[PDB]
Amino acid sequence: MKTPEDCTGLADIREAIDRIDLDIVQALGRRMDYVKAASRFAASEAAIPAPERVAAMLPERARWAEENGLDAPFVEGLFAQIIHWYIAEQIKYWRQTRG
Amino acid sequence: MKTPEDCTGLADIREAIDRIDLDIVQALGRRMDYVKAASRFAASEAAIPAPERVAAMLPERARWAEENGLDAPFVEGLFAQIIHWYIAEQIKYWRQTRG
Ligand SMILES: O=C(O)c1ccccc1O
Ligand SMILES: O=C(O)c1ccccc1O
């Protein structure tokens, strides 16, 4: 596993990107564990989507993007897609655990 | 950060989720370092998009999604977007520096 500067061709590059992508999938895997646990602190299925939390989360992620060398809008939009899939998945977990 | 099981409320849940989302953002920042470095292994900009690489990457991330208990099409849908963002970022960096 080589740093960007030590990479001598695309195989080296793609070895590190595959690893990074797997970390992202693994992190998303762990995120679902916390999103499912979040369902226990929801009094109803309507209490889950929590729009104020989403709206405040998103500019928070956009800033982190900038602090990491990335244009914000795309990263904000990416997290918008992530958060909504997890919301729907939480409702699905709430429905099967609470009816 | 507590374990999913030890979280008392939404405050503990959100602490963990913020940490994982930041982990993802940082992973994306490092991924950019590698994508930018990859421009020096392309003779022309035409070589950059490399559709053959995209086609192989996709089902591999789908497979990883399943191995981590996530919807394959969803995660596969996220990467299709990520990858095309970085291709477009790569080309810009390429023109900028002329690799
Ligand atoms: O997954 C999230 O971050 C989330 C945010 C707000 C409401 C429900 C959720 O699952
Ligand atoms: O970012 C990627 O994974 C990528 C993949 C194929 C071609 C160019 C790229 O930037």
From Swiss-Prot, chains A, B:
Organism: Pseudomonas aeruginosa (strain ATCC 15692 / DSM 22644 / CIP 104116 / JCM 14847 / LMG 12228 / 1C / PRS 101 / PAO1)
Pathway: Siderophore biosynthesis; salicylate biosynthesis
GO MF annotations, alphabetized: carbon-oxygen lyase activity; chorismate mutase activity; isochorismate pyruvate lyase activity
NCBIfam families: CM-like, PRK07075.1
Activity regulation annotation text: Inhibited by endo-oxabicyclic diacid resembling to the conformation of the transition state.
Any one GO BP annotation for this protein: pyochelin biosynthetic process
Cited function: Involved in the incorporation of salicylate into the siderophore pyochelin. Catalyzes the elimination of the enolpyruvyl side chain from isochorismate to yield salicylate and pyruvate via a rare pericyclic hydrogen transfer mechanism from C2 to C5. PchB also catalyzes the nonphysiological Claisen rearrangement of chorismate to prephenate in which the pyruvylenol tail is transferred from a C3 ether linkage to a C1-C9 linkage.
Keyword Lyase on entry: yes
Enzyme Commission number(s) from the entry: 4.2.99.21, 5.4.99.5
Outcome (variant: residue 43 to P): Slight reduction of the affinity for isochorismate and of the catalytic efficiency for isochorismate-pyruvate lyase activity. Slight reduction of the affinity for chorismate and of the catalytic efficiency for mutase activity
Induction summary: Repressed by iron.
SUPFAM superfamilies associated with the record: Chorismate mutase II
Protein name listed in UniProt: Isochorismate pyruvate lyase
Pfam families attached to this UniProt entry: CM_2
Domain Chorismate mutase residue range list: 4-94
